[PDB]
């Protein structure tokens, strides 16, 4: 006198929230309906486990505590106070429904260091200094995956190129916020 | 550790027709099999 999983999956509007034990509830139709509310984070997922909520694996051995950047950069006067409140940034925060569990801690432009290690010189004023991957693009044609990309020599003019920027993506209102301090 | 045999869920076997009547072992493995390769293969048979 109790539903089966496939039978209850046929009755509900949202079958992908139905689970193994959901057919064993006292009122599975209300349970599945509340599991589909447009909010309401689920249960911590370790209620059925047998390891007391602390997994003894995954190599938890690691550094004790990494202080924020603002921590490093009398002991310090109101000027270093000014520094601590100018450098203060908001850290990474999870939104309303992102519960923690034992496992979820581990799971046209080029950089200057890569350009220095690759042997590519800096961009001149008015000349042609392409990367070695640009000769194949000038010979075979533009890449179909990024048609809006511009390269100097083929689509962009030589005088463009400035510093380490060897490419620019050219994709083919009243944006000011209303109440803000001056 | 014959005790783990029955504590972890073994000696209780489940079968699935979508998977060649392949009989799976204790629930922790049985619940995971739907994501594994063999079940995807069996489901592709129907389309």
């Amino acid at each position: 006198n109790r539903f089966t999983v496939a039978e209850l999956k046929q009755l509900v509007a949202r079958p992908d929230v139905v689970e193994m034990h959901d057919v064993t509830a006292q009122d599975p139709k209300l349970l599945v309906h509340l599991k589909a509310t447009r909010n309401s984070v689920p249960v911590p997922r370790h209620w059925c486990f047998k390891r007391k909520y602390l997994q003894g694996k995954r190599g938890i051995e690691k550094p004790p505590f990494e202080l924020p950047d603002f921590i490093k950069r009398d002991i310090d006067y109101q000027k270093l106070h000014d520094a601590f409140f100018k450098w203060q940034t908001k850290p990474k925060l999870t939104i309303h429904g992102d519960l923690y569990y034992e496992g979820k801690e581990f799971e046209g432009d080029l950089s200057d260091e890569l350009r220095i290690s690759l042997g590519m010189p800096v961009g001149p004023n008015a000349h042609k200094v392409p990367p070695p991957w640009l000769i194949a693009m000038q010979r075979y044609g533009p890449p179909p995956s990024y048609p809006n990309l511009k390269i100097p020599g083929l689509n962009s003019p030589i005088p463009p190129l400035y510093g380490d920027v060897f490419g620019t993506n050219a994709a083919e209102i009243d944006r000011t916020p209303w109440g803000e301090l001056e | 550790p014959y005790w783990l045999y029955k504590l972890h869920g073994l000696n209780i076997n489940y079968n699935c027709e979508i998977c060649g009547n392949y009989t799976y072992r204790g629930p922790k493995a049985f619940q995971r099999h739907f994501a594994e390769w063999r079940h995807a293969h069996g489901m592709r048979c129907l389309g």
């Binding site: 589909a36 909010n39 939104i95 309303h96 429904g97 209102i173 009243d174 301090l181 001056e182 | -």
Partner: protein, 209 residues
């Protein structure tokens, strides 16, 4: 011009984009709270002011990360909107409108209530005014408590906690206290009662009458 804002009877706000060349209406953002919306007002391209059947006003803004070009994570939309303001008014608001009331004044948010009341919410422009009015409210919450036994901070947090609103109807009760308590309040703000009165009148005459 680009987006559509939808009010649900029990959900708060849905953001939609109309694809002019594909002929598609796509939902790209929603909220994380149930709200019984009575009316809504656009403040700018990213922010919406809402009202409620239960007497609350809220302001909801899209995070700057928000991607408009879409083709659920909480049984909803993939991206969420943040609540940056919450206030309990005590009466049901049915009209919200951004406008300038006096010639040569500043823009305010005018609301209207089912009991016949009219009120405004005005933004602060500096941190000093905000801090001064915050301290006035703090000190008047204790030394001039509501008459019928209610906690002022708890009343403005009836359904949701207050967020970024100063109650100027509590603050203007300073002008009606007795001189001894007016001095006790003013000497903590490092000021005299006439200066506090002038500062209270300045922000009112800047926006409203």
């Amino acid at each position: 011009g680009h987006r559509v804002i939808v009010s649900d009877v029990q959900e708060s706000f849905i953001w939609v984009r109309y694809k002019r060349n594909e002929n598609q209406l796509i939902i790209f953002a929603d909220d994380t709270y149930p709200r019984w919306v009575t009316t809504a007002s656009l403040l700018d391209y990213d922010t919406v002011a809402g009202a409620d059947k239960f007497g609350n006003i809220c302001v909801v803004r899209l995070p700057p990360n928000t991607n408009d070009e879409v083709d659920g994570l909480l049984n909803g939309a993939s991206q969420k909107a943040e609540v940056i303001m919450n206030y309990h008014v005590g009466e049901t608001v049915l009209s919200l409108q951004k406008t300038t009331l006096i010639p040569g004044g500043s823009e305010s948010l005018v609301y209207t209530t089912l009991s016949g009341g009219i009120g405004i919410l005005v933004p602060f422009t500096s941190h000093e005014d905000h801090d001064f009015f915050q301290h006035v409210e703090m000190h008047l919450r204790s030394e001039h408590p509501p008459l019928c036994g209610r906690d002022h901070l708890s009343f403005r947090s009836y359904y949701f906690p207050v967020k970024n609103v100063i109650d100027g109807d509590l603050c203007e009760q300073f002008n009606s206290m007795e001189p001894n308590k007016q001095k006790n309040v003013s000497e903590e703000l490092d000021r005299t009662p006439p200066e506090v009165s002038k500062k209270l009148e300045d922000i009112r005459t800047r926006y409203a009458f």
